[PDB]
Amino acid sequence: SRLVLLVNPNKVHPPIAPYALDVLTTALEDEGFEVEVLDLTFRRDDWKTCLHEYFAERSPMLVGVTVRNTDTVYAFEQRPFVGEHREIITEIRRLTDAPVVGGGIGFSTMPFALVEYFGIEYGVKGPGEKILCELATAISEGRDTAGIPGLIRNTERGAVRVPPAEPTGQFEPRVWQVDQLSVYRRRSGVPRKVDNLEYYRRGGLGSILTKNGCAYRCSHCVEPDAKGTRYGQRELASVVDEMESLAAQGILDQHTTDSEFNLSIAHAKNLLREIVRRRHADPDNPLNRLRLWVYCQPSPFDEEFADLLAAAGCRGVNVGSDHIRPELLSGWKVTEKGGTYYTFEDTERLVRLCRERGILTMVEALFGMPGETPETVRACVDAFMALDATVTGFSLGLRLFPYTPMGIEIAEQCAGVRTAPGLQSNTADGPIVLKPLRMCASPAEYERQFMFDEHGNFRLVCYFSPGLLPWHGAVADLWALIDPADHHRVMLPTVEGMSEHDNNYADNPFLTSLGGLGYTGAFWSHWRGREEIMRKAREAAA
Ligand code: B12
Ligand SMILES: CN(CC[C@H](N)C(=O)O)C[C@H]1O[C@@H](n2cnc3c(N)ncnc32)[C@H](O)[C@@H]1O
Ligand SMILES: N[C@@H](Cc1c[nH]c2ccccc12)C(=O)O
Ligand code: SF4
C-alpha cells in the first residue's frame, strides 16, 4: 500500500486552511504516494462520523495529524487545543492499527511531550515534507525506522529522536527539512484534498510561504526553534507560480506565512519584483488583483521595500513593534547575538511609508515582559496611539514555552527548587516550580511542564510582570488610557462582560461572521468599521 492519510483537527473559526497538508501532499505525491485529507474544520459537530466512514472504507498505512496550535497563546484565556486533538487521535487509533505521525508548528514547540501525550508512534519537529516522505517509504517498504534522520520515535521508555546532536533538537537550522524547489499545489473543490476556495469563501484568506525559519531569537517567540533558525528560501518562480494559481481560483487576499516577511530582505524584494513583472507582462494575469497581507518587523523597512509592496499589491502590514522602551526591549526583541535590531524610528517610518501608499497598518504591543510597570505601559500606549495606525493591538501577559528564551530563563530562576516571580496559571494548585532542561530526564518531561501539572491536568504557564501588581487590575488601567474617540481603532484585553475586543482571532464571534457577510483580507483590516458592518448585517437580517 502507498496510501497516506492526513487529518486536520483544527476546529478554530474563522477557518484557516491547513497549509501544512498541501505542502505534505505535494511532497508525498511527487514521491509516488496516494494522499487523502480528512479536514475536520467544517465537521466540528460530527467529526467522529467523518472518521467512522473513512476508516471503514479506506486502509491507509500511515496516518498523519497536523497540530497547528497547542493553545490560543492568549495569557488571559489559557484555552488548550491539545486535549481536543488527543480526543481525535484516540478515535483514530480505535479505528485502525496503522501508525500515527504528528507534526505542526505548535506541535514542534513540544514534540516529545505531545508524542507521549497523544500516544502515537512518530513525530516530526519543524518542516516535515522530507522526513514524512522517508517515513512513508519506510513503512510502505516494511523497513526499519530507527535510521530516519530527524524522526522522533515513541519507544516504550519514551519519545526518542534519530539524529539529523541535541536530544531535544532545539534551535537547529532545519533548512535541510525544507522543500525549497517545488510548487505547493493548492486545490479547490477536490474531495479528500484541502479545499482552499472553501476556506477563502468562509474565512476570507489564502496563504503563501516564501521562506521557512527565523534567524533571530526574540525571548517570547517559539518560531526560531519550532520552525528553524536559518532561512530556507523557496524558488521565487515557484512561490509566484503558487500565488498566481491561488489568484486564478479567485483567492485574492493572500497572507504570507513567513516568520517575518521583511527579514531576509533581498529575497523578499526579489519576490516583489517578480510579482510586479508578471502583473505588468499581462493584464489578464490574476496577480493583477492580488491583495497581499504580510508580517513585518520594524526593520528593515525602507522606501524601496514600501514601493515594491505597493506595486505588487500589498494591502496591509502587521508590524510586531511590541514595545518602545529600550529597557524592556533589551534582551527581548534581539538577534542571536543578543543585540536589538530596531528603534521606534523604524516603526514610525514603516507606518508613514504605508500611509503614503494607502497600505493599512496594525502595530502590535505585548505588555508584561520583565521590567513592565504601569508607567512603562502608559509610555508605550501614548507613543503607539500617536502613530495613527489602522489598528493598534494591545496584548497583556506572556505564554511560556520550553524553547523560548523566556521559558528557559524562567526555568533557570526556578532551578527545580522554587517558584519564580511573575509565574502564573489560571489552573495552578500552589507554587509553579519549573525545571531547566538539564535537570530533566527526557525532553518530554522538560516540555510537558509548560502545559501540564504533575497530576496531568492542564496548567498553561504564563509570565506577568510583578511590576503590574496592584493581573486583571492592569486591564482596567489599560482601558482608561484609550480615549473613547479611539476605542474603534484598538484591540485590548476586554473588561468584565464586554464584547470581545481582544487581539485574539481564535473563535472571535465578530470575525467569524465576516465570511458569511462577504468580507475578506486580514482579520484586522475590517476591525475599524465593525459597528457599521454589524448595523449593515441586521439591516439585511430584517
Ligand atoms: C500566518 C499566521 C497566522 C495567520 C494565518 C493566515 C493564513 N491565511 O494562513 C493568522 C493571523 C490568521 C493566524 C492566526 C492564528 N495563529 Co498564527 N501564525 C502564522 C504563522 C506566521 C505561519 C503559519 C503558516 O501557515 N506557516 C506555514 C506552514 C506551511 O507551515 P507549518 O504549518 O508550520 O507546517 C509545516 C511544519 O509544521 C510541518 N508539519 C505541519 N503539520 C504536519 C503534520 C505532520 C504529520 C508532519 C509529519 C509534519 C507537519 O510540515 C509543514 C510543511 O513544512 C505561524 C508561525 C510560523 N512561522 O509557521 C503563526 C502561529 C502558528 N500562529 C499562532 C497562533 C497562536 C495563532 C492564533 C491561535 C492566534 C489567536 N489567538 O487568534 C490564530 C489561530 C487561527 C486558526 N484558525 O488556527 C502561534 C502558534 C503557537 C502554538 N504554540 O501553537 C504561531 C507559532 C505564532 C507564534 N510565533 O506564536 N496565524
Ligand atoms: C504577531 N507576532 C509577530 C509575527 C510572528 N511571526 C507571529 O506569528 O507571532 C508578534 C505578536 O505575537 C504575539 N505572541 C507571540 N508569541 C507570544 C507568546 N508566547 N505569548 C503571547 N503572545 C505572543 C504577541 O501579541 C506579539 O506582539
Ligand atoms: N495579532 C496577530 C494574531 C494573534 C492574536 N493572538 C496571538 C497570539 C500569538 C500569535 C499571534 C496572535 C495578528 O494580527 O496577526
Ligand atoms: S518575533 Fe518575529 S523576528 Fe522575533 S523570533 Fe519571532 S518570528 Fe522571529
- Whether ligand 1 lies within 6 angstroms of the CB of 468 is answered as no
Query: Residue 225 maps to which CATH number?
Result: 3.80.30.20
List all residues 6 or more positions away from 488 whose beta carbon is below 8 Å from its beta carbon.
528, 530, 531
Cα angle 125-129-130, degrees, rounded to a multiple of 5: 90
Dist. CA 394 → ligand 2 center (Å): 11
Residue 447 marked as a ligand binder: no
Distance of CA 492 to the CA centre of its chain: 20
- The domain boundary, picked from 157, 177, 197, lies at 177
Packing angle, helices 265-281 and 236-248, rounded to 10:
50
Taking the C-alpha atoms of residue 74 and residue 251, their distance in angstroms, rounded to an integer, is: 29
| Residue 361 maps to a domain | yes
| Residue 182 maps to a domain | no
List all residues 6 or more positions away from 266 whose beta carbon is below 8 Å from its beta carbon.
none
Q: Give yes or no: residues 373 and 434 share one domain.
A: no
| Residue 195 maps to a domain | no
The domain in which residue 392 lies consists of 205-399+472-537
Instruction: Please state the φ and ψ torsions of residue 226, each to the nearest 5 degrees.
Output: -70, -30
| Residue 542 maps to a domain | no
Q: Are 422 and 464 in contact (CB under 8 A)?
A: yes
Q: Please list, residue by residue across 19-41, b when 16 or more beta carbons sit within 10 angstroms of its beta carbon and e when fewer do.
A: bbbbbbbbbbeebebebbbbbbb
Of the candidates 99, 97, 126, 102, the residue with the CA atom closest to the CA atom of residue 114: 102
| Residue 391 maps to a domain | yes
Paired sense of beta strands 211-212 and 291-296, if any: unpaired
List all residues 6 or more positions away from 118 whose beta carbon is below 8 Å from its beta carbon.
65, 85, 86, 89, 100, 102
Q: How many structural domains compose the chain?
A: 3
- Technique behind this structure? X-ray
Could you tell me where the beta strands, DSSP code E, fall in 464-513? 490-491
* DSSP conformational letter for 63: E
Q: For residue 378, count other CB atoms closer than 10 A to its CB.
A: 14
Q: How far is CA 218 from CA 83, 141, 297, 330, 406, in A?
A: 28, 42, 11, 10, 9
Question: What DSSP assignment string belongs to 347-397?
Answer: HHHHHHHHHHTT-EEEEEEEE-STT--HHHHHHHHHHHHTT--SEEEEEE-
Calculate Rg over the CA atoms of the chain: 23
Proximal ligand: closest to the CA of 262:
4
Dist. CA 353 → ligand 3 center (Å): 23
Residue with grid cell 505547493, as numbered in its chain: 184
Q: Give yes or no: residues 107 and 220 share one domain.
A: no
Packing angle, helices 129-140 and 19-30, rounded to 10:
50
Q: Give yes or no: residues 303 and 448 share one domain.
A: no
Q: Give yes or no: residues 168 and 230 share one domain.
A: no
| Residue 254 maps to a domain | yes
- Whether ligand 2 lies within 6 angstroms of the CB of 447 is answered as no
- Whether ligand 3 lies within 6 angstroms of the CB of 354 is answered as no
Query: Residue 107 maps to which CATH number?
Result: 3.40.50.280
Q: Give yes or no: residues 454 and 476 share one domain.
A: no
Q: For residue 270, count other CB atoms closer than 10 A to its CB.
A: 13
Residue 260 marked as a ligand binder: yes
Q: Give yes or no: residues 463 and 503 share one domain.
A: no
Instruction: Please state the φ and ψ torsions of residue 74, each to the nearest 5 degrees.
Output: -130, 110
- Whether ligand 2 lies within 6 angstroms of the CB of 259 is answered as yes
Q: Give yes or no: residues 350 and 218 share one domain.
A: yes
Helices (H), 58-186: 82-95, 105-108, 111-118, 129-140
Taking the C-alpha atoms of residue 63 and residue 34, their distance in angstroms, rounded to an integer, is: 12
| Residue 140 maps to a domain | yes
- Whether ligand 1 lies within 6 angstroms of the CB of 41 is answered as no
Q: Give yes or no: residues 227 and 80 share one domain.
A: no
- Whether ligand 4 lies within 6 angstroms of the CB of 224 is answered as yes
| Residue 191 maps to a domain | no
- The grid coordinates of residue 416 equal 527545580
Residue nearest to atom 7 of ligand 4 (CA): 259
Q: Give yes or no: residues 418 and 481 share one domain.
A: no
Question: What DSSP assignment string belongs to 298-362?
Answer: SSS--HHHHHHHHHHTEEEEEEEEE---HHHHTTTSB-TTS-B---HHHHHHHHHHHHHTT-EEE
- Whether ligand 2 lies within 6 angstroms of the CB of 521 is answered as no
Q: Which atom of ligand 4 is nearest to the CA of 222?
A: 6
List all residues 6 or more positions away from 44 whose beta carbon is below 8 Å from its beta carbon.
11
Q: Give yes or no: residues 387 and 279 share one domain.
A: yes
- The domain boundary, picked from 450, 467, 484, lies at 467
List all residues 6 or more positions away from 15 whose beta carbon is below 8 Å from its beta carbon.
41, 42, 199, 202, 203, 515
Proximal ligand: closest to the CA of 7:
1
Q: What is the SS3 assignment for 76-101?
A: CCCCECHHHHHHHHHHHHHHCCCCEE
Proximal ligand: closest to the CA of 524:
3
Q: Give yes or no: residues 285 and 323 share one domain.
A: yes
Q: Give yes or no: residues 339 and 244 share one domain.
A: yes
